[PDB]
Amino acid sequence: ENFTTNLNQLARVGGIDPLIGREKELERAIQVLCRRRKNNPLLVGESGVGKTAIAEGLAWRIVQGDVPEVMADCTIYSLDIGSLLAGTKYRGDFEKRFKALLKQLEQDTNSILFIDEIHTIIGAGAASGGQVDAANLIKPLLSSGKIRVIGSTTYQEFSNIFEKDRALARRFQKIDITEPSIEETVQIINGLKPKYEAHHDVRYTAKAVRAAVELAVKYINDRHLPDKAIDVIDEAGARARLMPVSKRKKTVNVADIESVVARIARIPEKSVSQSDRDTLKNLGDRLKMLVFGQDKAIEALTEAIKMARAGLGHEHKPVGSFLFAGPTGVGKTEVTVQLSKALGIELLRFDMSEYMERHTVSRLIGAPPGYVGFDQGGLLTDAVIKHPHAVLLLDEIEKAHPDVFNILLQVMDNGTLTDNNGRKADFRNVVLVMTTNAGVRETERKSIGLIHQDNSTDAMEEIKKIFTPEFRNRLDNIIWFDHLSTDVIHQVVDKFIVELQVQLDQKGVSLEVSQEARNWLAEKGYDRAMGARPMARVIQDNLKKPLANELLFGSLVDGGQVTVALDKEKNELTYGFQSA
Amino acid sequence: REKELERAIQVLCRRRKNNPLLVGESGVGKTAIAEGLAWRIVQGDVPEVMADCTIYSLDIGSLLAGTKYRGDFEKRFKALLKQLEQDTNSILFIDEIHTIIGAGAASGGQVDAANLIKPLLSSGKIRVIGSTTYQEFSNIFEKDRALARRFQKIDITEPSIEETVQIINGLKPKYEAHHDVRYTAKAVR
């Protein structure tokens, strides 16, 4: 009565969207209905392919008259399983409701029942010993063939639930539905375009509909092509309807589609705004103002990002894959940490020293199904999904097991990684920077001879031995970090002094340092083999240590006004220690 | 949260599958965006299309209160959806939406809120706002591909340091009255 709904009647009022194409599938389903045996068609397919539209769309064609004469007069009903169980409180209610519906169908012999998600009725209502399964009640009728019903199910549901019911499976004839091609999908949108256009009072451009089917499939990989494109089309109409005044956008241009596909896919958009162009162009000194030297390393990072945003980038590979090798204390990791801050994107750090063992890979991709750690999930996959546009940092990659390197081969070459749950992580927009310490022993080593030789070439051999040629063929560039020069150290000292000032500013103390004092600290702490890290120790013992005693128990509690100068006579620093 | 709420309003103005899903980490204001949408509507700082609309919060615990007999949940849940379709201007907010995926199964049945709402979300008859964490969305919600397709995942990102101080300033009048104290400009920073 009210549980079902005559889809044919619904089509007369425009309640079912029109069908486009799918002639081969419709003919197959119609043929399965006419045959004397196995008269019950089934539509196995993936989510979004359009299997539900084919069952409901069949009614739209019947009312239109573009169907065979045999199938010209047939009522199509849609079974709402929820309505069947609405008032099924007392015993025998399910039997009367279900049997009453079947009686009307068998007597007519023309009416056909469409049951979406037929796997649901396999476990229909049973309370106490009744065992009144909807499948068992309808099983005898399907065997004889008096009534024919259409079904819809997913591949998983058809195998996990429907395949178990062998009796129902034999009667039903599986029809496989596959997502149409890009050329076929654009025709579907053209047929559905008037309905969406009327709702939003807009007009989609013929070029724009094509870009929706191409941009979505390229970036959006979590849904099938027919629904995926429609989502972009439908959402683009709403964005144009919400314009500020008088609905300025009366047509949906290709630019609108690109903006809709960028936000949906959590990727940077095309035609970068002037705000982003300023920071991109200005990213020539900001990195050089914090990380002095290693200009070629900064250029590779900034060029790869500029190329990706400009539109010239790898189809399926990341924006950039780099291997940062060199001596200790160089800004291999600082340039990466300071890159995310300059761009204003999340920084994903992964100390690879924890993955020394081969079995430790389970925390990256996730444990297999049915294990204690399956619920926790992967750390790399989840982080990438949460922040697709981010700077990944695999520090101390050399310590990791060689098996971990194999995981990165797919990331660099394909940009898609499969986790335990099956979700595909997108590495197209994520930057890959892995700092390695291989060959550092040879760098600080001194040759057995009068003249010390350069071990840079020997260090590279260790990097080529640990990393197989496959790993080195997928990296965009290998940037060896050169040692810090004397003049560069002077800039590093200023950087650490600035940090000291910021720390003292919180406490309310100022700090003035003469230029001669800075040069003394540089030459004292300068060590080409130890990098810039020793410079922080000199600052700690010469500047932070005296101030700490005065700050805690001394005159420099507030006000500051500290001054630092070096007397050439004693060759030692002089601390003002003004109470202020 | 103008960008976040604008995308949500855009999804809610779609023809089909107009069911946004506020997916984000705990503490990023997921419930605030959905619950605050109602506060904005009453205040009046919302697009005209969203005005005159009523947002309702669903308590899944109250639906299953007295569902001892068969069909009490189905009739109770189905009746609720009819009210939304009648006015055709009401939105449903289901916090912790991952829970409804399996709720309502009595012994071995697949009839649940997911299947009961599924045919009504793909047709656009009703609008439902969801909110769930990444872990729950990836491990539970993502398993149901059919339900996930109907819901448009709207990602929520943690705000910056500057964006947080303005939020506290807006919330400060509510916390000051509770404790009858005052906060300084430096204390918030």
Partner: peptide, 25 residues
């Protein structure tokens, strides 16, 4: 030194099912 051997741990799965009631009259 001989290579190490790792042993996996499989978790069993068992769940409880509710029961709906139907009054006769």
């Amino acid at each position: 030194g001989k290579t190490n051997d790792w042993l996996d741990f499989d978790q069993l799965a068992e769940e409880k099912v509710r029961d709906a009631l139907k009054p006769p009259s």
